[PDB]
Every structure is written in C-alpha cells, then in structure tokens.
Design a protein around this nucleic acid. Sequence first.
DNA 1: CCTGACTCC
DNA 2: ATGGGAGTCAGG
Length: 576
Amino acid sequence: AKMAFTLADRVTEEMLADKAALVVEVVEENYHDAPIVGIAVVNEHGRFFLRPETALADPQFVAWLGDETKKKSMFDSKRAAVALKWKGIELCGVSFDLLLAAYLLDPAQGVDDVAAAAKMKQYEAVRPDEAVYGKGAKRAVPDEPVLAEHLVRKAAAIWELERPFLDELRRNEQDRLLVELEQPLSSILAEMEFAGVKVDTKRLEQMGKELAEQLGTVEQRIYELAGQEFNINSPKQLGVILFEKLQLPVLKKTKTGYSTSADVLEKLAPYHEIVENILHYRQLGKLQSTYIEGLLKVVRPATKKVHTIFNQALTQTGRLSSTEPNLQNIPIRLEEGRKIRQAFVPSESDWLIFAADYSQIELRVLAHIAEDDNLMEAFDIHTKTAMDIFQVSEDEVTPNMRRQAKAVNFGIVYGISDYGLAQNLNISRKEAAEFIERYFESFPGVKRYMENIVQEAKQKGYVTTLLHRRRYLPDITSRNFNVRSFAERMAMNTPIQGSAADIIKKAMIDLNARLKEERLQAHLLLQVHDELILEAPKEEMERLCRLVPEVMEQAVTLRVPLKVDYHYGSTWYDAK
DNA sequence: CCTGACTCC
DNA sequence: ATGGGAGTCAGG
Ligand SMILES: Nc1ccn([C@H]2CC[C@@H](COP(=O)(O)OP(=O)(O)OP(=O)(O)O)O2)c(=O)n1
Ligand SMILES: Nc1ccn([C@H]2CC[C@@H](COP(=O)(O)OP(=O)(O)OP(=O)(O)O)O2)c(=O)n1
Ligand SMILES: [Mg+2]
C-alpha cells in the first residue's frame, strides 16, 4: 500500500496517451443520468486523478474519450459509456473490459467490482467499492484524497491485470469470445439502454384506473366466498383461510407453512371456487403493482422513456438479464396482461415496432449438438406434442395446450422426473414415466447426449458452449443426492441454453453492422433471450422484413437451419 | 431484510 | 427429492 499519483487540476498531454487504464466512476447502481464523481487514468507516463467538472469540459479530454484509436482498458465499460452518454460525451476505443473477462473465466465468482476481480490473481492493492462508499443510508462519496486514491488504485489494478486475464482466457480458448463478441456487444447494449423505450403513460394510467376497480370487485367476491376479510396477498393469512377455515386438503408445505403456490391452488379448484378467484386476484395485483405502478415509477417524465440496464455479467449460462425495469418479463400469455404491451410505443411519429424471434432456436441447437436425426427431420414440434398428451387434432390445439406441451418438451429433454411431469399434467406417475421413456426412444441421440455430457462434467469439473463459454460444476461429484442431481441437470441444460445465448449475441452484432452499412435509422431497443425488438420509420419495414431475418439466420451455421419469425405494428402489442 | 408470490424466456 | 435461466413485488 504505497501508490504515487498526481491529483491533477487540469488535463495534460501525457494523460492522453494512446493506451490507458481508465476509470469513470459512478457510485449509484443505476447509472442512468447518474453523477460521475471522479476520473482516473493510468498509462505509461504515470497515474492521474481528474475532477469530472474539469476533465469533462476539456475539449482535448473529450476528444480523447471519443477517439477510437486511443485504446482504453476498463472495468464495466458499459456503465462508463452510458453515464458519459447522459453527460453528452461519446466514449470510444475500449479494448479491454476486466468485468467481462472475469465473467468469462468463471461466472460463479459473481465479480461485481475491481477488487473481486483482483482477488482472482492474488492482487490485493485495491479496496472493494463497498468498503470505500458504504451501505444503504450510509452510502457516500468520501473526502477527495480518499476518493482519488481509490479510483487510481482501481485503474492501476486494471493496468496490471489485463495481461494475466488475457493470458488465462487465451489458455482457455476464450479470448475471441471476449474480444470479438462480449466487448462489441457491450457497446450495442449501451446504445439500446440509452435509447430507451417510449411509453404511452396516458394509456398505462387509464389501464391502472380500470384495473383498480376490477381488483376491488374480485377482492370483495373473495371475501364473500371466504366469509371473512383478510389479506389475500399474505400467503400466511391465506393459508389459514384455505386450510384451517375452509379445511381444504394440504397438498404441499414449505419451511414457513402451507404452500399457496399457483400449482397447489389449481389442484384445489374442484374443492372450492374461491381458489380460482384468488389466482385471478394475485395475477391482477401483479399487473398493477409491477407493470403499471412499478413501470410508471421509472418512466422519465420529460421524454416518457424507460431505460433498462442489461446485466451482461450475471447469469450462469451466458444469458443477459434486465433490471430497473425488467423488460424481459412483460406479460404476454394472458390477454388481460398482454394489453400492457400496448403502452410500449415507438419513440417517434410515423415509426413502428419491429419484432423478430428465433423459432425454437434452442431445440435446433440441441439437435445440432446432440446430433439427433429424428429431431433434425422435424426441423410444429410443440403443437405436435400437444396433439399427443391431449390426444387431439392439430386444429383443436389451443394456444394454452400448445403452451402446456412446450413446457413438457423442455421438461423432458432437461431431465424432469416422473413426479414432476405427473404433477405438471395432473396425470398418473406411471403414465408420466412412460411418456418420458417414449420421448427418449423417439429421440435416441438426445438420450445419448444427455448421458455423455454428465459424465464429461464429472471428469472435467466444467461444461462449455459452442463459442467456448464455460460453467464450473464442483458439486457434480458430491456424495449428496440432491446436490449432485442439481449439478447433473445444469450439465444437461447449461450447454444448450448457453449456446443459444451465444448465437443471438452474435446476431445482434451482425445486425447492427448491417443496419449501419445500409444507413438505416432502424435500431435495437430490446433483447428478450430469443427475440430482438427494434423500432424504425415505417418506410424501413419493407427492408427490415428481409434484412433482420436474413442476418439472424446466418449468425451461425448448424446442421439445422435457423428460422426467424417476424411481425411489426404501432405498439409492441401489435408486433405479433 | 427474506420468502413466496407472479412475470418472462 | 423430483426440468433450466432470470427480476420485482407485498407481506412479514
Ligand atoms: N482462442 C479462441 C478460440 C476460439 N474461441 C471461441 C470463438 C469461436 C469458438 C469456435 O472455436 P474455433 O477454434 O475458432 O473453431 P472450431 O474449429 O469449431 O474449434 P472448436 O470445435 O474446438 O470449438 O470458440 C475463443 O473464444 N478463443
Ligand atoms: N418453460 C420454458 C420456456 C422456455 N425455455 C427456454 C427454452 C427455449 C427458450 C425460448 O423460449 P420460447 O420462445 O418460449 O420457446 P420456443 O421453443 O422458441 O417456442 P415458441 O415457438 O413458442 O417461441 O427459453 C425453457 O427452458 N423453459
Ligand atoms: Mg421462441
């Protein structure tokens, strides 16, 4: 702990070297329109701290941030890039991101700050962020000398750690994953987050007013049926009503008491009509609390946009997640909740929403990977399963039936048991067991594959995706049944979900390149795991109908072709 | 603050 | 004991 640095009053030439570690510090977790509290630069010439008020109003420093030929190493460069966009400054030339490097080396470490990354290489010359800024109501920027040292120490760590991390990624054959996929993706995600999605608040507010009335109506009906008022949103109070007052059968318990899960309640429907009303009430309550009230809370009022943050270094399989607000779990399955999507509108007059999704991309990936003839030949496979489990005609398969059969296809291939399946379809365990057995004989390649991948994980201690993403599974040889079994099912699932994640990431990169090449105004707004959502002038729809599916299809080559479905409309709802 | 709800892929 | 991966909310 002895680190020399200049606390600079003004930007100098030697801070603008062609390679540098750069820290642009934002303390708030949600970095949209958040204060930049300090800057640190480390390069061959030395270590510098700059006050943002100075640096960011300095035309040479701004010029250097925006010069792609001046290469910067950082940690969480998307955070910096977006915070700078909100200050009206363009950040270019990021060549190394320690956050993403750590994530690829081992997603389980949960690396969230430079110190946590530094620990991976026994680098101790830097403090965790939480130790410097503090928690909750105590959270604050420290005295300048202490802030400056922290930011310089983070930059020095990035400076020293770049090579050891790159060296290890190369050993793992993952450097291209970092440099050619994840880092370019981060810049595209930064663009999407900053663009935001426009919301029709008048529509959303009116929906909430009508939902309020309907909640009250259903609530009173529940009270009438129960013979008493109680808090329907307390599973504890509800448990007393259902299982003590009304004396309904107890099908399941958790550590806190009687289960009132949707699965349990649906099975109690033939006992008392109050359970169906309660399920509906909790659905309506979620719509209001989360997708009306929670959404309106994060709308920026002047522009009516919502700006999600896509976490690129969180999931254990290589998927993104979306927070504050989560735009990857907007309702769609019930028409009631689906109507929320009518409030998601284009950001400009005479623009439209364009949505494109990979049709069953994951199952095609498994077909390719497991090398299964029957599955490939099938390449509707979900509808086909609903004809089987419900024993019906193809033109009698309701979108609820198909939805149920999709859950069965994914259940089975990823190791559901006879018990789970029996519960899911409310059928006999014998019948469920024979359903699973039949599936594995119908597709013997999938069967062989799932056996092999588990043994491979036991031998190596990890599993990998098509583009060499890695998940370590140290629990996989555990003496404990439940613990071992979970790890076995991650070996079955992670390579396929993770590979499907790799592919759509590549597609986003490819797509943006083409949009730029063709000088289109169309741009990405959202990714929802197997779907890309764009907005564009209405004139570009014709072109987008060919371009976007073209690019997605040709992202990778597999034994099975990738298929893209696409729709467009006035609102997200209408993009179906 | 965690748990168990509901939401999506 | 009992397919996988996520985030947000009210209650307690
Ligand atoms: N140094 C490397 C090499 C590869 N990869 C990732 C990028 C794409 C994917 C493909 O691996 P390649 O060796 O480029 O192609 P391959 O012939 O299919 O090799 P393999 O079958 O082992 O994946 O792995 C990487 O991240 N870093
Ligand atoms: N119950 C589910 C639902 C989805 N997924 C994963 C598997 C596929 C991926 C995309 O989900 P969907 O788009 O709903 O599945 P799909 O096969 O593409 O079916 P559809 O044609 O209806 O989109 O997410 C899963 O593991 N379990
Ligand atoms: Mg799909």
